[PDB]
Amino acid sequence: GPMGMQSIREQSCRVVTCKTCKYTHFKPKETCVSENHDFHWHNGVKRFFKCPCGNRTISLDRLPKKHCSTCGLFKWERVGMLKEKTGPKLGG
Ligand SMILES: [Zn+2]
Ligand SMILES: [Zn+2]
């Protein structure tokens, strides 16, 4: 087998700061688009997380602030790459 890996389990992607609410994320919220807030787009790097019940999330920070949507506690663990960036074209 080959040597390494030499890379780290993250990936670079385009991200956005809402100037009206002062948060940074991968996209504006549906409420931020509907109320039509101002935002600045730029590139960043993202971090992947898992909860012990099997629930999942992602942040631009080293840990998310939010409680679990499935069991209601706070037990997020940092996890690695999803083994693919995306599938075929889908949705609208
Ligand atoms: Zn906003
Ligand atoms: Zn959970």
From Swiss-Prot:
Q: Where is this region: Zinc finger-like 2?
A: 18-37
Identify the stretch(es) annotated as Zinc finger-like 3.
51-71
List all membrane-crossing ranges. none
Name the domain of life.
Eukaryota
Its localization reads: Nucleus
Biological role = Acts as a replication initiation factor that brings together the MCM2-7 helicase and the DNA polymerase alpha/primase complex in order to initiate DNA replication. Additionally, plays a role in preventing DNA damage during replication.
Q: How is this protein organized at the quaternary level?
A: Self-associates.
Q: Read off the domain note.
A: Each zinc finger-like domain binds a zinc ion and is involved in both ssDNA and dsDNA binding, as is the OB-fold domain.
Q: Which family does it belong to?
A: Belongs to the MCM10 family.
For this entry, the protein name equals Protein MCM10 homolog
Boundaries of the shown chain within the full protein = 755 to 842 of 860
